[PDB]
Design a protein around this ligand. Structure first.
Ligand SMILES: Cc1cc2nc3c(=O)[nH]c(=O)nc-3n(C[C@H](O)[C@H](O)[C@H](O)COP(=O)(O)OP(=O)(O)OC[C@H]3O[C@@H](n4cnc5c(N)ncnc54)[C@H](O)[C@@H]3O)c2cc1C
Ligand SMILES: Nc1nc2c(c(=O)[nH]1)N[C@H]1C(S)=C(S)[C@@H](COP(=O)(O)O)O[C@H]1N2
Ligand SMILES: O=c1nc2[nH][nH]cc-2c(=O)[nH]1
Ligand code: MOS
Ligand code: MOS
Ligand code: FES
Ligand code: FES
Ligand SMILES: [Ca+2]
Ligand SMILES: [Ca+2]
Lengths: 1285, 99, 50, 50
């Protein structure tokens, strides 16, 4: 085996024993100790692992810099490459790079786990273009995901490279002359011509071919060998599909596979050319050559706009896309429609063939022999009379798998409209790229006219059939897109041959307006001390360390030399007896230590919030993902491989999957919950109108960028164990670990530094991992750790509850509500967990902001063979609020009244009682509403919307303004308690500890701001290290948005005790410093240590009597959103959102606006993009960012305005502030109701003229739901013997 | 702890003051983030002074549990502690002693 | 003294804000903490001695 | 203290001490220490940040 030689941050790395299966991410994190680069998904979709790669280009005589996903880069591709990580550009220990400084100062970093990946995307752009355009900046992030920030502050901070929350005049200018030089040793090695290399791993041999002759010899000797260039398919096959290719040849060095030739028929690219190189060449060709010659080039470019992101396009090869032959390839349909020419070679042979329908004979096969390789691809010039289109529709515009994707080419007779050639090639409609040959063959010699359109549509409807069991589902949507794509091509070709102006927008390729972002908040009083930071936009205290990669998350903690790795073994069945477990294959995997199951547990196998769960399944499994056991091994890869071959034998039991299955089988957790006020029968009797319906809202996966993880350290004394856990609930982690071990709680120490996201997902479900890792530490006597892969995390740890509602609303012709009944059903899954409390909060929010004198709400928890669902930001609130605004929206349509008038006239007034008899004091919705109407220019924009809808047939705009209120407190009274512990050391430095945990919400920042004000000392003198069960015991989970309120009071009270103890010393030396008083107190033997504690007063609602305070107060806000839908694809733009939020007197307007923007974007995700799909048998299909689409940089409203309400002190909380974590999430529903408005305009246009029709739109309003609701001549093309008269 | 049995004596003290068995009390270690500004363990005085500090911390716990003890006088230590927790009474305190 | 266990310190640098965690064979965690802080030139609240 | 497991990346320190009761330090030469396999660094007064 040869040495692998590369550079990391300017330092030479000589790896004498490269394993070909080693990724750069694993090497950086486990071999080089550089833990700033993160694992977020391992499948190329999140960008947390982004690094910069730099190399000398032979063919260009220059240093090139490009971004890459370290999770998919094999170290064996990196010989003589220079890597730069976040640690290579700057640090708080030296100096931050401008990119680091600006994302931190701009409030672009919350939990911080995505920050290094986004820093390295922005850094790479700046190394290529030191003064980028706003569009280049946004395009940098097509391959980066952030769950916390809602993206706006990251883009606004970085826009500086092309009162106020930040000041750009403070920012250090970028100086490219101060960037680290390309390693001089690497620039010397460019002189030595390349040699074939061989790397030998535990399972795989890797040959780096230097010449074409070597490649063809190797393929003649080893025809089965997999080529690898980018590894962006093979990496997925190896990791996710359990594929092992014992021999790999990498031909990326070969000059013939990298050549770019401009010929008379078109532009030839070597099959190893990166898609980013293709894109750069085709853009230059489109800029230089006449329009009529670049029709196919512009089709390719349109597909490449929506092809993954920069990281994947910089490494993905042409040849890899073509030969992978995925049914959903975005390039193969374009190459097929254009007859792109393929040059194929083997030792002693060569042929050129135009790609056509025969090139792809069956699933994942092409017409290459086993000895052949794709050498080069010639993309053709277009001819006179020859036009081309390419279209892609997915679940999300940016970085998504095609639902349907196409290439379309037409050649006319010279100067005519008479078809000579027609090719319509589609991905996503079969197990391979297909041509609609039957359909197109019937149009040869026909003219481009309405009859050709009708004939092609009817033909595509017959020829591109999908049986009801088609993989991917969405049968009606995919068939519609195939026609809708042809219609767009049809109209585009009419324009190019030369349309009614109402038809023009159907021919426009996607274009966004430039961004416009305004944040309004309140200046602090004129006299406030500069050291009093309460009400100031102080950045998150860890933001700079998050941007530098210095912030330690759980898995970033260095491993002990004797530390082992745990892999969970989970059920593949919804409901079965476990008959046997065989570990005989697992025991053979190198580094295998043990298999653990229920019988290894020394204490109790009973766990969970309601004691209704197993630590490890015994006798029975009750969901796919049900934890049966765990493998422990010496490396994570060995634990994974051994777990995969543990063989479980099952005997299936009857399974209950869905809400409908649970209702039919009477499968519920406990008895009905109910709130009832007034007289429903009389209310319905008084009603002019009654509407009845049903509504469904899909679940949600948290997609915290940091997945669940626990390190368990057994001390070997008295049962003692110390755990480092990504959890919001250190107290339940401690007691659950103790109960499973059968030891007192005082033996178990849980430490939480920070989480890269929690969002409710880590309130309880983190224990599934903690208790398994603790058992492993107990059984082995070694440190053990487990961090979940994304696919495990999505399968096992639960999500937001899906809700089904049956509702009945009685109202007057004026829109006034007089009666309401709503029956709520949640899909709870296979344990209680928090499902009961979530249904209570749903029932407390069924009113939204509306007075309903006669009201009955019920709730049932469905017990099902699905992973147990849990807390998610909003905690049942968002489901019940969505059901409310859905029937409210239907009242306004039924009445023929503007929706804002019907909402306003139903709104509570100051001093009203809710349906649960709580008095609304300081009810600020009316101020938020009037201010949001004014600053959003709602009335003027409603007439602009109507005008656009009259002028546009195939696009429509929608506008909606909705209010919210959110009850602030745990519904479980005893959880409304908070402890702090404060130490003043003899240097006067202060260590604060409280029960709350940091997950990016800026709690420790706010607690430091609170202690600094209370003590009257600068924040610089105060520090919070972590959360731990041996500093503050019996802590509530960091939950219900109340942490600032309750830990703020506990910290405040601990500060007052300290002030009272220093008072005698301050009096005796009034001109002294803090440090003088503290030393004098110490020398007088006064304690500088105290607890603080807070208990929220006057809480305790009863469902039986409908009396007592559920909440301490309500957080309020209003959001107005405008969208444009594409009626032909189901894609939409978020044009503009304006929010006004009442957060009382904000402790920190930067963190509060960041919570409003973040919450709003997670809601936008809930209601419009995020969908989990399950087999009929209960197996989750959607287990990574490739299939589960959270909001991307490009998803946010293009004009995004946030105001915090002025002059609204809240006397019920610390320094007059209000909880902000969860309340703003529901305001994301404004986009859903604007989409519904736009769909009503589409249905007025092409479906029917019933202006009072109520069409059901379930959540989420994905492109499938939007396209299918826009019923037209296309949906119609995509019978019984008798019918009663 | 350096072998002189200080942690043993502090557990014996806390058990007497709280009137619970030593089996319910544990001392894991000494740390600057639990008790700051500590004198060195020296001058033979550690039993005297930490014993007072532990004693006083135990007196605060007992005062906090007293309403729950008077409410349920036949209950167990565990009943009183859970009743205190459910009533949102703090079960964390400092103790201090100055000779 | 001839303590059977000689002097011993483990020092764990956390990499954030000068933070360090030390495991020490000492009768004087307080002076260990303030002397380590003085040498590093960081506030005492950054240094944990166990 | 020394029974606590070592981290995989944990290093070992050995003090360099005076062999003289009272003297000027004229020079220190680490050029032989540098050749010992696994040598990481030599620390002296100048390395102290505080
Ligand atoms: C996050 C993400 C997003 C993606 N988005 C898209 C998308 O939007 N559209 C899409 O179409 N694809 C997409 N892909 C798939 C993938 O990136 C592309 O297919 C890419 O072109 C694969 O090329 P590669 O060099 O990485 O292939 P590798 O994984 O290196 O190899 C792929 C296959 O091609 C074979 N091969 C490669 N070169 C040759 C050759 N010259 N001759 C013969 N066989 C050869 C290999 O043996 C292997 O079978 C995405 C992938 C990821 C990870
Ligand atoms: N960046 C960030 N913001 C977040 C979360 C998170 O995990 N990350 N969780 C949310 C949820 S679910 C809650 S309940 C609150 C809890 O924090 P608080 O009580 O300190 O607001 O933060 C919210 N905002
Ligand atoms: O048990 C609860 N857990 C919660 N998390 N967020 C709000 C909650 C509540 O009311 N009750
Ligand atoms: O209350 Mo947040 O943890 S759902
Ligand atoms: O006072 Mo003992 O530590 S000589
Ligand atoms: S971890 Fe590499 S893209 Fe997500
Ligand atoms: S700050 Fe981006 S994922 Fe948390
Ligand atoms: Ca989850
Ligand atoms: Ca549940």
């Amino acid at each position: 085996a040869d040495e692998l030689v590369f550079f990391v941050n300017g330092k030479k790395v000589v790896e004498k024993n490269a394993d070909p299966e080693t990724t750069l991410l694993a090497y950086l994190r486990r071999k080089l100790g550089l833990r700033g680069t993160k694992l977020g998904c391992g499948e190329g979709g999140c960008g947390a692992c982004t690094v910069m790669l730099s190399k000398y280009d032979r063919l260009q005589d220059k240093i090139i810099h490009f971004s890459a996903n370290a999770c998919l880069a094999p170290i064996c591709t990196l010989h003589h490459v220079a890597v730069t990580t976040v640690e290579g550009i700057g640090s708080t220990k030296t100096r931050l790079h401008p990119v680091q400084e600006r994302i931190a100062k701009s409030h672009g970093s919350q939990c911080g786990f995505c920050t290094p990946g986004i820093v390295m995307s922005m850094y790479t752009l700046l190394r290529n273009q030191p003064e980028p355009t706003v569009e280049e900046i946004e395009d940098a992030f097509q391959g980066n995901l952030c769950r916390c920030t809602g993206y706006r502050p990251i883009l606004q901070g970085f826009r500086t490279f092309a009162p106020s929350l930040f000041n750009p005049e403070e920012f250090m200018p970028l100086d490219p002359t101060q960037e680290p030089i390309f390693p001089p040793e690497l620039l010397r090695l460019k002189d030595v011509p390349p040699k074939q290399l061989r790397f030998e791993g535990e399972r795989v041999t890797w040959i780096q071919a230097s010449t074409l002759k070597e490649l063809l010899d190797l393929k003649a000797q080893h025809p089965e060998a997999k080529l690898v260039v980018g590894n962006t398919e093979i990496g997925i096959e190896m990791k996710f599909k359990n594929q092992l290719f014992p021999m790999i040849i990498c031909p990326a060095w070969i000059p013939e596979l990298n050549a770019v030739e401009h010929g008379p028929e078109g532009i030839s690219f070597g099959a190893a050319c990166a898609l980013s190189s293709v894109e750069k060449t085709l853009l230059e060709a489109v800029a230089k050559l006449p329009t009529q010659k670049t029709e196919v080039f512009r089709g390719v470019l349109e597909q490449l706009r929506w092809f993954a992101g920069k990281q994947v396009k910089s490494v993905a090869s042409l040849g890899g896309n073509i030969i992978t032959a995925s049914p959903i390839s975005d390039l193969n349909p374009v190459f097929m429609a254009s007859g792109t020419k393929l040059t194929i070679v083997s030792r002693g042979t060569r042929r050129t063939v135009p790609m056509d329908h025969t090139f792809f004979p069956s699933y994942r096969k092409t017409l290459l022999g086993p000895e052949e390789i794709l050498l080069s691809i010639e993309i053709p010039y277009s001819r006179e009379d020859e036009f081309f289109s390419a279209f892609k529709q997915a679940s999300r515009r940016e970085d998504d798998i095609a639902k349907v994707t196409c290439g379309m080419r037409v050649l006319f007779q010279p100067g005519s409209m008479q078809v000579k050639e027609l090719a319509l090639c589609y991905g996503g409609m079969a197990d391979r790229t297909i041509s609609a040959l039957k359909t197109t063959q019937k149009q040869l010699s026909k003219f481009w006219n309405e009859k050709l359109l009708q004939d092609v549509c009817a033909g595509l409807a017959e020829e591109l059939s999908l049986s009801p069991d088609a993989p991917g589902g969405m049968i009606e949507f995919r068939r519609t897109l195939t026609l809708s794509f042809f219609f767009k091509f049809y109209l585009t070709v009419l324009k190019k041959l030369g349309l009614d102006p109402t038809y023009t927008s159907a021919t426009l390729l996607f274009q966004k307006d430039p961004p416009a972002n305004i944040q309004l908040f309140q200046e602090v009083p004129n006299g406030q001390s500069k050291e009093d930071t309460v009400g100031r936009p102080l950045p998150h205290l860890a933001a700079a360390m998050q941007a530098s990669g210095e912030a330690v998350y759980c898995d970033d903690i260095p491993r002990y030399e004797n530390e082992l790795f745990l892999r969970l073994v989970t059920s593949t069945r919804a409901h079965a007896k476990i008959k046997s477990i065989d570990v005989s294959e697992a025991q053979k995997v190198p580094g295998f230590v043990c298999f653990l199951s229920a019988d290894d547990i020394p204490g109790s196998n009973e766990t969970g919030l309601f004691n209704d769960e197993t630590v490890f399944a015994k006798d029975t499994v009750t969901c796919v993902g049900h934890i049966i056991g765990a493998v422990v091994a010496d490396t994570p890869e060995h634990a994974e491989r051994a777990a995969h071959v543990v063989k479980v034998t099952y005997e299936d039991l009857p399974a209950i999957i869905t809400i409908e299955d649970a209702i039919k089988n009477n499968s519920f957790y406990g008895s009905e919950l109910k709130i009832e006020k007034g007289d429903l029968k009389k209310g319905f009797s008084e009603a002019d109108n009654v509407v009845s319906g049903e509504l469904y809202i899909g679940g949600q996966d948290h997609f915290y960028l940091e997945t669940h993880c626990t390190i368990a350290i057994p001390k070997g004394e008295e049962g003692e164990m110390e755990l480092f856990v990504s959890t919001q609930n250190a107290m339940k982690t401690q007691s659950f670990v103790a109960k499973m071990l059968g030891v007192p709680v005082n033996r178990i120490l849980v430490r939480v530094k920070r989480m890269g996201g929690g969002f409710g997902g880590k309130e309880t479900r983190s224990t599934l991992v903690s208790v398994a890792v603790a058992l492993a530490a107990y059984k082995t006597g070694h440190p053990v750790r487990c961090m979940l892969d994304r696919n495990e995390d999505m399968l096992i740890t639960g999500g937001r509850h899906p809700f089904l509602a049956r509702y009945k609303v009685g109202f007057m012709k004026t829109g006034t509500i007089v009666a309401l009944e709503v029956d709520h059903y949640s899909n709870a899954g296979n344990s209680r967990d928090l499902s009961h409390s979530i249904m209570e909060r749903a029932l407390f929010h069924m009113d939204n902001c509306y007075k309903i004198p006669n009201i009955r709400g019920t709730g049932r928890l469905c017990k099902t063979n699905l992973s147990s669902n849990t807390a998610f930001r909003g905690f049942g609130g968002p489901q019940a609020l969505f059901i409310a605004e859905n029937w409210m929206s239907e009242v306004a349509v039924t009445c023929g009244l503007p929706a804002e008038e019907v909402r306003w006239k139903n709104m509570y007034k100051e001093g009203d009682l809710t349906h649960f008899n709580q008095r609304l004091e300081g009810f600020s919705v009316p101020r938020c509403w009037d201010e949001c109407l004014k600053s959003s220019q709602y009335y003027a924009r409603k007439s602009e919307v109507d005008k656009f809808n009259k002028e546009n047939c195939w696009k429509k705009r929608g506008l909606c303004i909705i209010p919210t209120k959110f009850g602030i407190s745990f519904t479980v009274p005893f959880l409304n308690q908070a402890g702090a512990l404060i130490h003043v050391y003899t240097d006067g430095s202060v260590l604060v500890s409280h029960g709350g945990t940091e997950m990016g919400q800026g709690l420790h920042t706010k607690m430091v701001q609170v202690a600094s004000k209370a003590l009257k000392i600068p924040i610089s003198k105060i520090y919070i290290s972590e959360t731990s069960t041996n500093t503050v015991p019996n802590s509530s989970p960091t939950a219900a948005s109340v942490s600032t309120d309750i830990y703020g009071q506990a910290v405040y009270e601990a500060c007052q005790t300290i002030l009272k103890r220093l008072e005698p010393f301050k009096k005796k030396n009034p001109d002294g410093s803090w440090e003088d008083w503290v030393m004098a107190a110490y020398q007088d033997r006064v304690s500088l240590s105290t607890t603080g504690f807070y208990r929220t007063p006057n809480l305790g609602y009863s469902f039986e009597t409908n009396s007592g305070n559920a909440f301490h107060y309500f957080t309020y806000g209003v959001a107005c959103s405008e969208v444009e839908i594409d009626c032909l694809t189901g894609d939409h733009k978020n044009l503009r959102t304006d929010i006004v939020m009442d957060v009382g007197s904000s402790l920190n307007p930067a963190i509060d606006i960041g919570q409003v923007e973040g919450a709003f974007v997670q809601g936008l995700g809930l209601f419009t993009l995020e969908e989990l799909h399950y087999s009929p048998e209960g197996s989750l299909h959607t287990r990574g960012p490739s299939t589960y689409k959270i909001p991307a940089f490009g998803s946010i409203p293009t004009e995004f305005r946030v105001s915090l309400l002025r002059d609204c002190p809240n006397k019920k909380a610390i320094y007059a502030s209000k909880a902000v974590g969860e309340p703003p999430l529901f305001l994301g529903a404004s986009v859903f109701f604007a989409i519904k408005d736009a769909i009503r305009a589409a249905r007025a246009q092409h479906t029917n003229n019933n202006t009072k029709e109520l069409f059901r739109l379930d959540s989420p309003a994905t492109p499938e739901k939007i396209r299918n609701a826009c019923v037209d001549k296309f949906t119609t093309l995509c019978k019984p013997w008798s019918l009663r008269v």
